[PDB]
């Protein structure tokens, strides 16, 4: 639960935050769109990413908000993207974080066809150890694990982002987006009590989407797997009542197939918990593997 090559990069990040101090709108110059923007801080030669959530509420709440997003200063990990500061401007709270030049895994999967099993083995450790950090050292669960919020870079780190720290920002956001891909656990959909087991399922279903190259609900028939119009409620009712999705028997090792099957168990008590997955054959095998992640990244993305 500790490396030293990893210990240099975090000590290198803790020094880059001494450089910024405090923040305000005129400090930042828009570079590119990513809602989030890749922006150029001028008081510090550090390219950040800024997320801008629109909120319209009275001042006693926006200060209660920023106080709760101060927690991300304290949390620091090689499997969690770096938090700098959180300030309010122009009817929008802005969170500036570490920028990551490879993007989310859902856009690298968008450009690649499918992600080969060996790479998916590393990321699971990232995710596995990522979430285990916040449950053990902060008593928070992520609440929104999905491909769009797993970030990669040309240096080869993988970290999580976009997680549920501020219970009042949860309440203050006015409207939510729902689409054809849901990553919500069947126990959350049904309104019953939930723990980090929901994030494990959200990881399982993310892993089979990335290994197949298609969101796996509803499951494809034999015609679409050989070559490799629905309403929200029937997708969600499929997720609760139909047997969970599963990797194709032929092309993936039996350790991997089981690894997702154990994440995609419906009963959250029988589902694998955080460190049952730490000792699973599939991640013991990938741990002691040498994959050049940065190499596969820069080669298929083009950077």
């Amino acid at each position: 639960e500790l490396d030293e090559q990893q210990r240099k990069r975090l000590e290198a990040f803790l020094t880059q935050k001494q450089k910024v101090g405090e923040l305000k709108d005129d400090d930042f110059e828009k570079i590119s769109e990513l809602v989030v923007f890749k922006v150029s801080h001028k008081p510090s030669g550090l390219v950040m990413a800024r997320k801008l959530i629109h909120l319209e509420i009275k001042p006693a709440i926006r200060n209660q908000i920023i106080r709760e997003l101060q927690v991300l200063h304290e949390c620091n990990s090689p499997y969690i993207v770096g938090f700098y500061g959180a300030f309010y401007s122009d009817g929008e709270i802005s969170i500036c974080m570490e920028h990551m030049d490879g993007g989310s895994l859902d856009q690298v999967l968008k450009k690649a066809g499918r992600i080969p099993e060996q790479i998916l083995g590393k990321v699971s450790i990232a995710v596995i150890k990522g979430l285990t950090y916040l449950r053990e050292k902060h008593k928070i669960m992520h609440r929104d694990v999905k491909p769009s919020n797993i970030l990669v870079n040309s240096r080869g780190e993988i970290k999580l982002c976009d997680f549920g720290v501020s219970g009042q920002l949860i309440d203050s956001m006015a409207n939510s987006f729902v689409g054809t891909r849901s990553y919500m656990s069947p126990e959350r959909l049904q309104g019953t009590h939930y723990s980090v087991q929901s994030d494990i399922w959200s990881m399982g279903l993310s892993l089979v989407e990335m290994a197949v190259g298609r969101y796996p609900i509803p499951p494809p028939d034999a015609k679409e797997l050989e070559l490799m119009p629905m309403a929200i409620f029937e997708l969600l009712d499929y997720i609760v009542n139909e047997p969970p999705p599963k990797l194709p028997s032929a092309v993936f090792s039996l350790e991997f197939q089981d690894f997702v099957n154990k994440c995609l168990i419906k009963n959250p008590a029988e589902r694998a918990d955080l460190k049952q997955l730490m000792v699973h054959a599939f991640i013991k095998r990938s741990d002691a593997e040498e994959v050049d992640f940065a190499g596969w990244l820069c080669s298929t993305i083009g950077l």
Partner: protein, 277 residues
Amino acid sequence: TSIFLQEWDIPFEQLEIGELIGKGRFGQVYHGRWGEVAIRLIDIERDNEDQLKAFKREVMAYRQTRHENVVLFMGACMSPPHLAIITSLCKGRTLYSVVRDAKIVLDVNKTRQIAQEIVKGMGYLHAKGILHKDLKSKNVFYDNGKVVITDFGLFSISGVLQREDKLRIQNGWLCHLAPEIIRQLSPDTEEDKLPFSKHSDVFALGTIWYELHAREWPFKTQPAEAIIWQMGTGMKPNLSQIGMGKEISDILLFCWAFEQEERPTFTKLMDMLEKLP
């Protein structure tokens, strides 16, 4: 192809526009003068003749409405791309803002009354063949016992749904939607083609009745995807957790009934609300 303001029976010499009354998803709502009035300006595409003739179909209906629990439709001038709808201005606060003010007593006799006013108003709009399609406490006004419904029929022509493959859902909307509707929300759904009915409007009254006693919306804790599944399959709260008797809680079971035909008319509901203690 146009609607002039002299086409109305309200005598109109001059119209003044004041400050903005509030933010809203559908056009803007200004203060006005005519007496004092509420001007809702909305924008359309220059040449979308199919949605504009559909809008004239609406307002001709409202020209016939007058009822003391329904906001007074006064006029509506349509010279594209700019349109306005002019109703009288409501003194006082929204039922939404009254429900959420700690300083305000909401006893079980008074909530039984505020619900009866909405029901009367809603019987009247049904009587005339007008579905509301967006009944909610932010579209009911309350001021010392007078209760006015606003924004009826707007949702048809509204466009409050408009990202890619991702339907924008605002907090509070889904828990007013009867299941026949919830089961059909897609990222392709359009407001003009959702199956509203007199039954879906009664459902939405149920959500106000819950809200009157709970002093918050139902499904307040849960995420949106959770709400869609729970409500599509029939799962509804009750009011026993805050000590409301059988009869206050029997209202909800009738209004929120899963099969539409089991939900009352507004006339029947008016009778059921008279029989409370």
